[PDB]
Amino acid sequence: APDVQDCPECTLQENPFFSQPGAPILQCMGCCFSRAYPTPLRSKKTMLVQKNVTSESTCCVAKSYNRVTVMGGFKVENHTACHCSTCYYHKS
Ligand SMILES: *[C@@H]1O[C@H](CO)[C@@H](O)[C@H](O)[C@H]1NC(C)=O
Ligand SMILES: *[C@@H]1O[C@H](CO)[C@@H](O)[C@H](O)[C@H]1NC(C)=O
């Protein structure tokens, strides 16, 4: 691709704190790319209807965690797995 749209590939960003010769904690951080597709609808009311987002801020709430609460009681849910989308409350 031309570039990276200033966004990496959603995943774990190994804890730059807990990372030690035997324990490289994490913290899912990145971008899960985007999947948009324009479609010529009808739009009842004004030119547009209701509010809609471009959809890109995908959430990969670690599918699985190995949580290793660090400094200030951090929580890297020592991510063992990360799955974009599916959050505790989408649309916000
Ligand atoms: C965190 O999870 C990764 C992947 O399973 C593992 O390699 C690492 O040892 C874990 N870190 C700790 C402190 O358990
Ligand atoms: C979002 O709303 C705008 C309103 O103008 C519309 O043009 C666009 O097609 C909508 N996007 C999607 C994915 O429906």
Coordinates of N, CA and C and ligand atoms in Angstrom, one line a residue:
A1 N 0.8 -1.2 0.0 CA 0.0 0.0 0.0 C 0.9 1.3 0.0
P2 N 0.3 2.4 -0.5 CA 1.0 3.7 -0.5 C 1.7 4.0 0.8
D3 N 1.1 3.7 1.9 CA 1.6 4.0 3.2 C 0.9 3.2 4.3
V4 N 0.8 3.7 5.5 CA 0.1 3.1 6.6 C -1.0 3.9 7.2
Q5 N -1.5 4.9 6.4 CA -2.5 5.8 6.9 C -2.3 6.3 8.3
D6 N -1.0 6.3 8.7 CA -0.7 6.7 10.0 C -1.3 5.9 11.1
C7 N -1.4 4.6 10.8 CA -2.1 3.6 11.7 C -1.5 2.2 11.5
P8 N -1.0 1.6 12.6 CA -0.4 0.3 12.6 C -1.5 -0.8 12.5
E9 N -1.1 -2.1 12.7 CA -2.0 -3.2 12.7 C -2.4 -3.6 14.1
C10 N -3.6 -3.2 14.5 CA -4.1 -3.5 15.8 C -3.4 -4.8 16.4
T11 N -2.9 -4.7 17.6 CA -2.3 -5.8 18.3 C -1.7 -5.4 19.6
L12 N -1.0 -6.3 20.2 CA -0.4 -6.0 21.5 C 0.9 -5.2 21.4
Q13 N 1.1 -4.2 22.2 CA 2.3 -3.4 22.2 C 3.1 -3.6 23.4
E14 N 3.6 -4.8 23.6 CA 4.4 -5.3 24.7 C 4.6 -4.1 25.7
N15 N 4.3 -4.4 26.9 CA 4.5 -3.5 28.0 C 5.9 -3.0 28.1
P16 N 6.2 -1.7 27.8 CA 7.5 -1.1 27.8 C 7.9 -0.9 29.3
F17 N 7.3 -1.5 30.2 CA 7.5 -1.4 31.6 C 7.8 -2.8 32.2
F18 N 6.8 -3.7 32.0 CA 6.9 -5.0 32.6 C 7.8 -5.9 31.8
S19 N 8.2 -5.4 30.6 CA 9.1 -6.1 29.7 C 10.5 -6.4 30.4
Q20 N 10.6 -7.7 30.8 CA 11.9 -8.1 31.4 C 12.3 -9.4 30.9
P21 N 13.6 -9.8 31.0 CA 14.2 -11.0 30.6 C 13.4 -12.2 31.1
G22 N 12.2 -12.4 30.7 CA 11.3 -13.5 31.1 C 9.9 -13.1 31.2
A23 N 9.6 -11.8 31.0 CA 8.2 -11.3 31.1 C 8.0 -10.0 30.3
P24 N 7.5 -10.2 29.1 CA 7.3 -9.1 28.2 C 5.8 -8.7 28.0
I25 N 5.2 -8.2 29.1 CA 3.8 -7.8 29.1 C 3.4 -7.1 27.9
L26 N 2.2 -6.6 27.9 CA 1.6 -6.0 26.7 C 0.5 -5.0 26.9
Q27 N -0.3 -4.8 25.9 CA -1.3 -3.8 26.0 C -1.8 -3.5 24.6
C28 N -2.7 -4.3 24.1 CA -3.3 -4.1 22.7 C -3.3 -2.6 22.3
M29 N -2.5 -2.3 21.3 CA -2.5 -0.9 20.8 C -2.1 -0.9 19.3
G30 N -3.0 -0.3 18.5 CA -2.8 -0.2 17.1 C -4.0 0.2 16.3
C31 N -4.0 -0.1 15.0 CA -5.1 0.2 14.2 C -5.5 -1.1 13.4
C32 N -6.8 -1.4 13.4 CA -7.3 -2.6 12.7 C -7.7 -2.2 11.3
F33 N -7.1 -1.2 10.7 CA -7.5 -0.8 9.3 C -8.9 -0.3 9.2
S34 N -9.4 -0.1 8.0 CA -10.8 0.4 7.9 C -11.5 -0.4 6.7
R35 N -12.8 -0.5 6.8 CA -13.6 -1.2 5.8 C -14.9 -0.4 5.5
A36 N -14.7 0.6 4.7 CA -15.9 1.4 4.3 C -16.3 1.2 2.8
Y37 N -17.6 1.4 2.6 CA -18.1 1.2 1.2 C -19.3 2.1 1.0
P38 N -19.2 3.2 0.3 CA -20.3 4.2 0.0 C -21.4 3.5 -0.8
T39 N -22.6 3.9 -0.4 CA -23.8 3.4 -1.1 C -24.8 4.5 -1.3
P40 N -25.3 4.7 -2.5 CA -26.3 5.7 -2.8 C -27.7 5.3 -2.3
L41 N -28.0 5.7 -1.1 CA -29.3 5.4 -0.5 C -30.4 6.4 -1.0
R42 N -31.2 6.8 -0.1 CA -32.3 7.8 -0.4 C -32.2 9.0 0.6
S43 N -31.9 8.7 1.8 CA -31.8 9.8 2.8 C -33.2 10.5 3.0
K44 N -34.0 9.9 3.8 CA -35.4 10.5 4.0 C -35.3 12.0 4.3
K45 N -35.0 12.4 5.5 CA -34.9 13.8 5.9 C -33.8 14.5 5.1
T46 N -33.3 15.6 5.7 CA -32.3 16.4 5.0 C -31.3 15.5 4.2
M47 N -30.5 16.2 3.4 CA -29.5 15.4 2.6 C -29.1 14.1 3.2
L48 N -28.9 14.2 4.5 CA -28.5 13.0 5.3 C -29.6 12.7 6.4
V49 N -29.5 11.5 7.0 CA -30.4 11.1 8.1 C -29.6 10.5 9.3
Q50 N -29.9 11.1 10.4 CA -29.2 10.7 11.6 C -27.7 10.9 11.5
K51 N -27.0 10.5 12.6 CA -25.5 10.6 12.6 C -24.8 9.3 12.4
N52 N -23.8 9.3 11.5 CA -23.0 8.1 11.2 C -21.6 8.4 11.1
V53 N -20.7 7.4 11.6 CA -19.3 7.6 11.6 C -18.6 6.8 10.4
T54 N -17.4 7.2 10.1 CA -16.7 6.5 9.0 C -16.3 5.1 9.4
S55 N -16.4 4.8 10.7 CA -16.0 3.5 11.2 C -14.6 3.1 10.9
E56 N -13.7 3.2 11.9 CA -12.3 2.9 11.7 C -11.7 2.6 13.1
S57 N -12.1 3.2 14.1 CA -11.6 3.0 15.5 C -12.0 1.6 16.0
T58 N -11.6 0.6 15.3 CA -11.9 -0.8 15.7 C -11.3 -1.1 17.1
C59 N -12.0 -1.9 17.8 CA -11.5 -2.3 19.2 C -11.2 -3.8 19.2
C60 N -10.0 -4.1 19.6 CA -9.5 -5.5 19.7 C -9.3 -5.8 21.2
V61 N -10.3 -5.6 22.0 CA -10.2 -5.9 23.4 C -9.7 -7.3 23.7
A62 N -8.4 -7.4 23.7 CA -7.7 -8.7 23.9 C -8.7 -9.8 24.1
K63 N -8.7 -10.7 23.1 CA -9.6 -11.9 23.2 C -9.3 -12.7 24.4
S64 N -8.1 -12.6 24.8 CA -7.7 -13.3 26.0 C -6.6 -12.5 26.7
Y65 N -6.5 -12.5 28.0 CA -5.5 -11.7 28.8 C -4.7 -12.5 29.8
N66 N -3.6 -12.0 30.1 CA -2.8 -12.6 31.2 C -2.4 -11.6 32.2
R67 N -3.3 -10.6 32.2 CA -3.2 -9.5 33.1 C -2.1 -9.5 34.1
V68 N -1.3 -8.5 34.1 CA -0.1 -8.3 35.0 C -0.1 -6.9 35.6
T69 N -1.2 -6.5 36.1 CA -1.3 -5.2 36.7 C 0.1 -4.6 37.1
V70 N 0.5 -3.5 36.5 CA 1.7 -2.9 36.8 C 1.6 -1.6 37.5
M71 N 2.6 -0.8 37.4 CA 2.7 0.5 38.0 C 1.3 1.2 38.1
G72 N 1.0 1.9 39.1 CA -0.3 2.6 39.3 C -1.4 1.6 39.1
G73 N -1.1 0.3 39.3 CA -2.2 -0.7 39.2 C -2.6 -0.8 37.7
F74 N -1.6 -0.7 36.8 CA -1.9 -0.9 35.4 C -2.6 -2.2 35.1
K75 N -3.0 -2.4 33.9 CA -3.8 -3.6 33.5 C -3.5 -3.9 32.0
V76 N -2.5 -4.7 31.7 CA -2.2 -5.1 30.4 C -2.9 -6.4 30.0
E77 N -3.8 -6.8 30.9 CA -4.5 -8.0 30.7 C -3.6 -8.9 29.8
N78 N -2.3 -8.8 30.2 CA -1.2 -9.5 29.4 C -1.8 -10.2 28.3
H79 N -2.3 -9.4 27.3 CA -3.0 -9.9 26.2 C -2.4 -11.1 25.5
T80 N -3.1 -12.1 25.5 CA -2.7 -13.4 24.9 C -3.4 -13.5 23.5
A81 N -4.5 -12.7 23.4 CA -5.2 -12.7 22.1 C -6.0 -11.4 22.0
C82 N -6.1 -10.9 20.8 CA -6.8 -9.6 20.5 C -7.7 -9.7 19.3
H83 N -9.0 -9.4 19.5 CA -9.9 -9.4 18.4 C -10.6 -8.1 18.2
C84 N -10.3 -7.4 17.1 CA -10.9 -6.1 16.8 C -12.4 -6.1 17.0
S85 N -13.1 -5.0 16.9 CA -14.5 -4.9 17.0 C -15.0 -5.5 18.3
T86 N -16.3 -5.8 18.4 CA -16.9 -6.3 19.6 C -16.3 -5.7 20.9
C87 N -17.0 -4.7 21.4 CA -16.6 -4.0 22.6 C -17.7 -4.0 23.7
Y88 N -17.4 -3.4 24.9 CA -18.4 -3.4 25.9 C -19.4 -2.3 25.7
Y89 N -19.4 -1.7 24.5 CA -20.3 -0.7 24.2 C -19.9 0.1 22.9
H90 N -20.3 -0.5 21.8 CA -19.9 0.2 20.5 C -20.7 1.4 20.2
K91 N -20.1 2.3 19.4 CA -20.8 3.6 19.1 C -20.6 4.6 20.2
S92 N -19.5 5.2 20.2 CA -19.2 6.2 21.3 C -17.9 7.0 20.9
Ligands
LIG1 C1 2.2 -12.4 28.4 O1 1.6 -13.2 27.4 C2 2.6 -13.6 26.4 C3 1.9 -14.4 25.3 O2 1.2 -15.5 25.9 C4 3.7 -14.4 27.1 O3 4.7 -14.8 26.2 C5 4.3 -13.7 28.3 O4 5.2 -14.6 29.0 C6 3.2 -13.2 29.2 N1 3.8 -12.4 30.2 C7 3.7 -12.7 31.5 C8 4.4 -11.8 32.5 O5 3.1 -13.7 31.9
LIG2 C1 -23.0 8.5 6.3 O1 -23.9 9.6 6.2 C2 -23.7 10.4 5.0 C3 -24.6 11.6 5.0 O2 -24.4 12.4 4.0 C4 -23.9 9.5 3.7 O3 -23.6 10.3 2.6 C5 -23.0 8.3 3.8 O4 -23.3 7.4 2.7 C6 -23.2 7.5 5.1 N1 -22.3 6.4 5.2 C7 -22.7 5.2 5.2 C8 -21.7 4.1 5.3 O5 -23.9 4.9 5.2

